[PDB]
Design an enzyme around this catalytic site. Sequence first.
Site, short mmCIF file in Angstrom:
data_model
loop_
_atom_site.label_atom_id
_atom_site.label_comp_id
_atom_site.label_asym_id
_atom_site.label_seq_id
_atom_site.Cartn_x
_atom_site.Cartn_y
_atom_site.Cartn_z
CG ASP A 150 -8.77 34.10 49.47
OD1 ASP A 150 -9.84 33.17 49.50
OD2 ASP A 150 -9.66 34.33 48.46
NE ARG A 154 -12.77 32.46 46.76
CZ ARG A 154 -13.00 31.07 48.09
NH1 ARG A 154 -13.38 30.24 48.14
NH2 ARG A 154 -12.32 31.69 49.28
CG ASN A 155 -8.13 31.97 44.84
OD1 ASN A 155 -8.19 32.57 44.79
ND2 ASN A 155 -8.53 32.56 45.84
CG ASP A 168 -6.16 34.77 43.05
OD1 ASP A 168 -5.34 33.89 43.75
OD2 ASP A 168 -6.32 35.94 42.76
C1 LIG Z 1 -6.82 41.92 45.42
C2 LIG Z 1 -6.14 40.74 45.07
N1 LIG Z 1 -6.34 39.18 45.89
C3 LIG Z 1 -6.24 38.24 45.51
C4 LIG Z 1 -5.13 38.54 44.58
N2 LIG Z 1 -4.88 37.08 45.11
C5 LIG Z 1 -3.77 36.65 44.93
O1 LIG Z 1 -2.65 37.31 45.44
N3 LIG Z 1 -2.99 35.06 44.84
C6 LIG Z 1 -1.77 34.62 44.69
C7 LIG Z 1 -2.15 33.96 43.64
C8 LIG Z 1 -1.37 35.34 42.58
C9 LIG Z 1 -0.63 34.21 41.67
C10 LIG Z 1 -0.03 33.49 41.41
C11 LIG Z 1 0.69 32.95 42.12
C12 LIG Z 1 -0.09 33.24 43.51
C13 LIG Z 1 0.16 32.21 44.63
F1 LIG Z 1 1.01 32.83 46.01
F2 LIG Z 1 -0.51 31.63 45.28
F3 LIG Z 1 1.34 32.09 44.61
C14 LIG Z 1 -4.41 39.44 44.06
C15 LIG Z 1 -3.20 39.39 43.32
C16 LIG Z 1 -2.27 40.54 42.99
C17 LIG Z 1 -1.27 40.01 42.23
C18 LIG Z 1 -1.33 38.86 41.51
C19 LIG Z 1 -2.32 38.22 41.40
C20 LIG Z 1 -3.38 38.27 42.05
N4 LIG Z 1 -4.84 40.65 44.20
#
Ligand SMILES: Cc1ncc(NC(=O)NCc2ccccc2C(F)(F)F)c(-c2ccccc2)n1
Length: 296
Positions: A150, A154-155, A168
């Site tokens: 995703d 926004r993320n 996010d």
């Molecule tokens: C239901 C739902 N949909 C989407 C989500 N978002 C994600 O997984 N974003 C990735 C993410 C988040 C925080 C830090 C780093 C990252 C990454 F992987 F990019 F490095 C979460 C989420 C579940 C745990 C911690 C927060 C977000 N939960």
Amino acid sequence: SSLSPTDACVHHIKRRDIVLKWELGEGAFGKVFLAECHNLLPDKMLVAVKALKESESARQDFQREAELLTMLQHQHIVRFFGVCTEGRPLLMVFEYMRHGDLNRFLRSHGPDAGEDVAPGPLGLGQLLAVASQVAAGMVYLAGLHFVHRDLATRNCLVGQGLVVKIGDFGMSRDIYSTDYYRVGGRTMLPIRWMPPESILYRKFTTESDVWSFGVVLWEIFTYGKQPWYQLSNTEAIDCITQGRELERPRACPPEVYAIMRGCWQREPQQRHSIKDVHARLQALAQAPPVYLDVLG
Ligand SMILES: Cc1ncc(NC(=O)NCc2ccccc2C(F)(F)F)c(-c2ccccc2)n1
């Protein structure tokens, strides 16, 4: 949970070391709070606390996510400090990013809208700075062989000093619901950011993230406009699958639009690597004003 490969390790925080201040956000899976955290880094600091709503299937999902986030420590990935699993609600502790999500930041610093940024719209130099940092975070995830399902402004989060990081707190499907197309029951797909191989064949690889990054690059140069805003979800699906590409944003120079187009090659293998896309954006971001002034 947005990551896909292509418990002792998890840091723990005592519930008394977390002092909730107020709500920052709310979604279908929980709430986000701003909190004061004590003895986290050597006396006290602000943090964003994600509280998980309710449950045994969700508790194991939480544990795996915390383990994954622990592994994911880098300069352009939102910092994860650890969890608080001593009682309910289960908590995830992250760094606080002053300016909020990158989509909101872009919109509030666009022609349709000052400690860290100048007055008026963000200049070419700062738009390229923003783009380069997001690309740097993708280079790191691709390097660990993780696909971000995703990727969108926004993320991404913006902190003090216009530091941009991927991350996010899981409320995008609630806050930015029009950025998703609802399908088979409860599933919501970010179709406007998806490449043809995802829409057509349901394949999502490292090359699919290069395509999504090209859409992120487009969002930046349009100051957070929704890709294909003029179109309904099915019309957007027709465009992507028929090979129609997003037009060069007004604020986007041809050199940068060339980078976007290179992310949007129909054949995944023909797309440049995220490492090369980053290299080209960083070279432009750090280019002398004399050079940048003749680009746009
Ligand atoms: C239901 C739902 N949909 C989407 C989500 N978002 C994600 O997984 N974003 C990735 C993410 C988040 C925080 C830090 C780093 C990252 C990454 F992987 F990019 F490095 C979460 C989420 C579940 C745990 C911690 C927060 C977000 N939960």
